[PDB]
Design a protein around this ligand. Structure first.
Ligand SMILES: *[C@](O)(C(N)=O)[C@H](CC1CC1)NC(=O)[C@@H]1[C@@H]2[C@H](CN1C(=O)[C@@H](NC(=O)OC(C)(C)C)C(C)(C)C)C2(C)C
Ligand SMILES: [Zn+2]
Ligand SMILES: [Zn+2]
Lengths: 23, 184, 151, 17
């Protein structure tokens, strides 16, 4: 068979504004 | 997801890791999100999870399997004509649901997590309100087209370009998904 | 991660700043002709528009610039200093009615914040609240056209 | 001197670290 399709990343839509944590 | 439509990207593997995983077919990385940035040794594109299934364009996925923790997963649906293929959504992903409001104002989410406005002109076409070079759209095949509520209206298929600029985009309406599942 | 919206403070007041097209804009009635702090020393405003209540310094570190709206939707969304999103019906080119009015306390300190279209693209900059009996049920805003104009 | 200080940041997409 040929190569398997590989997930190389994601795009998340569920996200909502957040105050980037101080760290 | 919607109200307003915001999105972000995260790379989870690199070139060498991808290749082994392609051959190996076993992927143990953790999955999150509605849209996965998919890749074959041939090219990279997107796959969108809608109602429990992870779709993408046949002209990218061919009849390949998708690397998963439990090895390779065979396609649930395959329609050369509809240009769609689908595997059960990877464990960990989130699915979008079909639009039910007939809005003609669609938002194309690109591989770079940029949601852009397209106005529907046809059952499978919308025009960019702000045309962009096709290099931008490159790799966004299979990405979703969301109505103002964040629901799947269709999947990005081709760029309607000229001189290298993209004025519109052809898509596969979510209607084709249902047809394809009822089909094979 | 890069923040598109900065939460800023002045000796007296705190407000917000929104990065658009490489510039960090805010409300002149908050910033004045002040300079923004930087690990290399104070930076000065590239733009000062005392008529439009608009000021802009070059975008700071850790920021991301929002994209202007090009769809012209009327269904706007306001993001406060607390990261809350507030739906708004664009009534005019510079005013919108909160789909659900809130006490001014809830919108307080959010000036400078972005007004986003359904695509999360900058439609305008939150300028001030319009309240009847201390209940904000509408807001004034600096449309991006102005921002792009001043550039 | 009397400047404007960035005291926090907001990522509209919700992107975590
Ligand atoms: C996706 O498959 C991907 N890999 O990202 C691409 C994304 C487009 C923006 C570059 N889609 C395609 O390459 C489709 C594939 C081939 C032709 N495609 C195009 O986008 C064409 N345009 C095109 O065919 O347009 C019409 C209107 C259908 C004639 C261009 C942009 C490559 C010239 C198919 C349709 C199978
Ligand atoms: Zn809908
Ligand atoms: Zn817009």
């Amino acid at each position: 068979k040929k190569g398997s399709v590989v997930i190389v990343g994601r795009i998340v839509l569920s996200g909502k504004p957040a105050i980037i944590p101080k760290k | 997801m919607g109200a307003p439509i915001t999105a972000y990207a995260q790379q989870t593997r690199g070139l060498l890791g991808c290749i082994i995983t392609s051959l190996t077919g076993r992927d143990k990385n953790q999955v999150e999100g509605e849209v996965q940035i998919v890749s074959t040794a041939t090219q990279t594109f997107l796959a969108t999870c809608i109602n429990g299934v992870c779709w993408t364009v046949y002209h990218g996925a061919g009849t390949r399997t998708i690397a998963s923790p439990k090895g390779p997963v065979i396609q649930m649906y395959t329609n050369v004509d509809q240009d769609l293929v689908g595997w059960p959504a990877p464990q960990g992903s989130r699915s979008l649901t079909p639009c039910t409001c007939g809005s003609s104002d669609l938002y194309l989410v690109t591989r770079h997590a940029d949601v852009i406005p397209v106005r529907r002109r046809g059952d499978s076409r919308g025009s960019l309100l702000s045309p962009r070079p096709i290099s931008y759209l490159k790799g966004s095949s299979g990405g979703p087209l969301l109505c103002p509520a964040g629901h799947a209206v269709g999947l990005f298929r081709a760029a309607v370009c000229t001189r290298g600029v993209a004025k519109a985009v052809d898509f596969i309406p979510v209607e084709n998904l249902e047809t394809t599942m009822r089909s094979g």
